Amino acid sequence: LEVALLRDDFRQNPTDVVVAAGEPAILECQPPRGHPEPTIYWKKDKVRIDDKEERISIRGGKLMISNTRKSDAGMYTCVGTNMVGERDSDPAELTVFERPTFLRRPINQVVLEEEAVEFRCQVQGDPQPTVRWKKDDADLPRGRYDIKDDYTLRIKKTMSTDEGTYMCIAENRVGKMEASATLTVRA
Ligand code: NA
Numbered sequence: 001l002e003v004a005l006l007r008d009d010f011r012q013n014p015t016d017v018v019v020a021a022g023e024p025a026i027l028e029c030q031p032p033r034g035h036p037e038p039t040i041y042w043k044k045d046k047v048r049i050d051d052k053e054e055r056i057s058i059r060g061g062k063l064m065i066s067n068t069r070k071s072d073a074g075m076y077t078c079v080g081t082n083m084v085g086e087r088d089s090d091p092a093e094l095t096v097f098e099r100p101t102f103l104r105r106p107i108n109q110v111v112l113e114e115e116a117v118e119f120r121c122q123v124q125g126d127p128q129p130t131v132r133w134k135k136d137d138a139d140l141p142r143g144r145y146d147i148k149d150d151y152t153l154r155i156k157k158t159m160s161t162d163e164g165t166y167m168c169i170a171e172n173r174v175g176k177m178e179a180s181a182t183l184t185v186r187a
Contacts, residue, residue, distance in 0.1 A: 006084035007032035012061065014078050014092035020099045020174040025065040025072070027094070031080025032087050038080040045074045068096045099175030100125035106168050106181040111158050113187055119153040121168035121179070132169040134180075160185045 011030035019025045031038040042049055042063045051058040055066040065072055073096045078089040104122035111117045123129045131151040133140055144162065146154035155162065167180035 002035045004035060004084055006034040006038065006080070006082055006087060008087060010078070010080065010087070010089045013090045014063075014076060016093045016095070018095045018097065018174075019068045021068055021070060021096050022099075023068055025068050025094055027063040027065075027076055027078070027092055029061045029063075029078035029080075029089060031078070031089075034080070034082050034084060036082050038082040038087070041079050041081065043077040043079060046077070048079075065094070068094075070096050070098070072096055097172070097174040098124075098126040100129035100170035100172050100177050102168075102170065102177065102179055105179045106153075106166065108182045108184070110184040110186070113159060113185055114157050117155050117158050117183065119166055119168075119181060119183075121151045121153075121170075123151075123168075123170040123177075125170065125172045125174075127172045129170040129172040132171065134167040134169065136164040137167070158183075158185060160187070 009032050012028060014027040014029050017025045017027060029040050031040050042058060057064040073094050075091040075093055077091045080087040101124050103124050104120050106119045106121050109117050121131055123131055133153055144155055148154065162183055163185050164183065165180045166183055167178055170177045
């Protein structure tokens with residue numbers, strides 16, 4: 001003699017998850033109290049899903065998504081079920097971002113004193129990565145460098161002190177990536 005019952009308040013709602021593509025995502029749910037003890041299943045944008053695919057696993061209170069792809073993003077809902085009815089959790093957004101990569105890596109230059117040189121860096125990612133430039137792991141000297149819109153690093157009248165390793169850094173909220181290239185000067 002226990003009450004046939006289903007509450008409306010989840011013991012644990014799933015919470016939003018932010019991931020870089022390739023990383024795993026884990027959503028957690030505990031259903032409301034009830035009798036009989038509710039089970040759970042999961043919906044993605046109101047459509048019920050299953051653990052058919054190898055990279056998806058549903059067990060306990062967890063939905064586990066290995067090797068996230070941009071497709072995986074959406075609103076995930078946990079549903080608590082028993083013979084009284086179904087209850088929908090507050091939804092959790094899965095965001096899948098893309099760690100920055102290089103469309104165009106900068107390439108070693110070799111140049112004779114007093115004469116133009118340019119270095120190129122084109123990046124991709126989601127969000128769009130912030131591009132930074134360095135020299136010998138320190139800030140670009142003043143006066144010298146001309147800057148196009150695209151992250152092209154330009155010089156009109158090169159000189160010997162300009163010698164060293166020039167690094168392009170691409171950075172968003174989900175990763176960082178470095179690519180450097182030598183500038184060689186000759187009298
Ligand atoms: Na599976």
